[PDB]
């Protein structure tokens, strides 16, 4: 007819004028506390508009589901996965879910504190992303409950969450450590540290362990989750470059970096390490090597190393590498001991695994291996025994404390990881600590950290009562969601926990 065929307005022809959408008025300022107040007029690296963002993600979902729904369900990829790993994913998925859910709120602060229009469009797009990843992790549990071998814990993870101390930390690593604090700082705690360092081993490297043990559900979802997390990094980086160019704002960088780095790796390191090695059968490699690749050599190398742009190598790295070698071993002792709390089944390290540990962690058998052997001898896998490893901790004078800061359970009489007990008394309340950094955080700011631990709340309570109040049973009302073994025979009932009489004590009462 009249002229040719242009729709010649792509996303990038509209995005060219997106920066001008913002006008100068008076109260055009952030509604949040922040000490970072340099000019932050940065450009969004992936020049997205709303509809083109939606299209891209729609393509991801398009291929993602259907693989789930058509082929993987045909291949029965939800059953031909493998029990320990089936139980492991309840924790991995649900905890990622809440971490990525808090990322939405953290982005809310990043969005609100943004000064460029491109980034406000970008950060709301990121909000949508973290909402997606939420629904994605939500979908993994959904699928594994619907098609898997043990749906219990996959189906009610969000309330059976509440019985165990590992959950308490998860509400701090990639969550309260993000949203509860400085707003512009979220460029560091959420993005320079969280999404630039720990998302990789936790979302990418887990898929390997998944695929090694028959899970092809997790790779399809998680490897699509991370696809979004790379644009996040680049936009956070731009806020970082703004900070480091203002002498009045760069001064806050190193401490906040270090405070963030420790905050996350304090829980990240022992919990993901123990989920990989103790929650699987086929190992991909030692967790330290995963930790040394992603965290130390690549993240630290290409990010922290490159910045120097006076940015310092974290002070707590020395302790972290040590935690990277031992913390995950220290923690499974606790987790397996406190097995009647979780929403998942746990298993003892078999013979081939003990050899694997000893071969890659020299000293493992003499310390950990013998303990598991004793526990096995006492009948921890047998409901007719009347034994839980917690009893062994008490018999042998081995107290278990919860860090007031990180919420990570620890046992200073057994720990080979970089943890050291500290007990204080303030205003008629005693506070326990497992490192110098956490104790420094509470010493300076004791009003941020008032989180009641499982011992303070369950003090004077009988174990089975707590498990039953929080619906830790299965559909019969008899059987527990948690088990000390992974077989489907001779499962522990409620009356088997009530058979023994484990009443909780607040360990600090000993002082």
């Amino acid at each position: 007819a009249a002229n040719r065929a242009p729709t010649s307005v792509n996303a990038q022809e509209v995005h060219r004028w997106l920066q001008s959408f913002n006008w100068d008025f008076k109260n055009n300022r952030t509604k949040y506390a922040t000490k970072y107040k340099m000019a932050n007029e940065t450009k969004e690296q992936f020049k997205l508009i709303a509809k083109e963002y939606a299209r891209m993600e729609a393509v991801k979902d398009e291929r993602q589901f259907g693989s789930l729904q058509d082929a993987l369900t045909r291949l029965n990829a939800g059953v031909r996965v493998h029990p320990k790993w089936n139980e492991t994913m309840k924790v991995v998925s649900n905890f990622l879910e809440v971490g990525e859910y808090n990322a939405i709120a953290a982005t809310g602060m990043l969005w609100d504190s943004a000064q460029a229009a491109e980034q406000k469009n970008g950060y709301l797009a990121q909000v949508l992303d973290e909402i997606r990843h939420t629904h994605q992790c939500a979908y993994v549990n959904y699928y594994f409950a619907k098609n898997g071998q043990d749906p219990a814990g996959h189906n009610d993870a969000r309330r059976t969450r509440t019985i165990g101390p590992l959950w308490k930390g998860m509400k701090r690593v990639f969550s309260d450590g993000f949203i509860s604090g400085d707003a512009v700082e979220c460029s560091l705690n959420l993005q320079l540290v969280g999404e630039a360092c720990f998302t990789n081993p936790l979302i990418v490297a887990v898929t390997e362990w998944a695929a090694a043990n028959g899970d092809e559900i997790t790779p399809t979802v998680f490897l699509s989750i991370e696809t979004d997390e790379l644009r996040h990094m680049a936009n956070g980086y731009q806020t970082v470059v703004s900070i480091a160019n203002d002498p009045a704002s760069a001064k806050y960088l190193n401490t906040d970096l270090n405070n963030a780095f420790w905050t996350q790796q304090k829980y990240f390191t022992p919990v993901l390490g123990m989920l990989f090695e103790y929650g699987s059968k086929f190992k991909v490699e030692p967790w330290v090597k995963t930790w040394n690749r992603w965290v130390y050599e690549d993240w630290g190398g290409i990010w922290i190393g490159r910045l120097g742009y006076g940015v310092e190598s974290p002070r707590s790295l020395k302790d972290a590498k040590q935690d990277a070698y031992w913390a995950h071993h220290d923690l499974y002792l606790l987790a397996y001991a406190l097995w009647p709390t979780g929403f998942f089944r746990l298993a003892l390290p078999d013979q081939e695994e003990m050899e694997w540990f000893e071969a890659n962690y020299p000293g493992w058998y003499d310390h950990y291996g013998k303990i598991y052997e004793e526990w096995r001898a006492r009948g921890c896998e047998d409901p007719s025994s009347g034994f839980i490893p917690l009893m062994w901790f008490i018999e042998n004078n081995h107290p278990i404390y919860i860090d007031r800061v990180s919420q990570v359970p620890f046992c200073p009489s057994l720990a080979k990881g970089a943890s050291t007990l500290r007990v204080h008394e303030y205003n008629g309340q005693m506070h326990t600590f497992s490192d110098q950094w956490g104790e420094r955080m509470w010493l300076a700011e004791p009003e941020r950290y008032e989180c009641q631990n499982i011992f303070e709340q369950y003090e004077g309570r009988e174990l089975s009562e707590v498990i039953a109040e929080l619906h830790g049973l299965r559909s019969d009302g008899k059987t527990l969601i948690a088990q000390p073994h992974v077989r489907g025979d001779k499962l522990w009932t409620l009356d088997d926990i009530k058979r023994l009489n484990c009443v909780f004590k607040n360990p600090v009462k000993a002082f």
């Binding site: 891209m56 680049a234 290409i302 742009y309």
Partner: protein
């Protein structure tokens, strides 16, 4: 170059005490700068084709001899000295269909380095954008 960019480049590939002895002492308790880059490509039909027919054959051979591709379970782990740039119009041509960068980011799973777009070209570089 290509082999210093391997996943298991030393000290990875040391076992037991030989690994601990290097991981626990002593100049390795502080962070070391790296002019490299990491690119995680999610495994798919479009991406495998790209790696096999553009990355390993054209880009590696003609622009960046140092790019190392490793096979993990569900993804390709890629590392290189300097940067990696992907013109997506070549992927479009090679796939026999329409394809822009946002179609490409569908299977670009992760990055370690500062990444960005400009037109339909995808860049991931070691260079600190805004400080250098």
């Amino acid at each position: 170059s290509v082999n210093s960019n391997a996943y298991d480049a030393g000290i990875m590939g040391l076992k037991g005490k030989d690994f601990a002895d290097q991981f626990f002492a002593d100049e390795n308790q502080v962070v070391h700068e790296s002019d490299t880059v990491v690119l995680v490509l999610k495994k798919s039909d479009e991406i495998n084709t790209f790696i096999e027919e553009i990355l390993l054959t054209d880009y590696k051979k003609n622009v960046n001899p140092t790019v190392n591709v490793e096979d993990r379970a569900g993804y390709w782990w890629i590392k290189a000295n300097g940067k990696i740039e992907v013109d997506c119009d070549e992927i479009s041509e090679l796939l026999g269909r329409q394809f822009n960068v946002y179609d490409f980011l569908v299977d670009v799973s992760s990055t370690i380095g500062r990444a960005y777009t400009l037109g339909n070209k995808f860049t991931i570089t070691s260079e600190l954008m805004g400080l250098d």
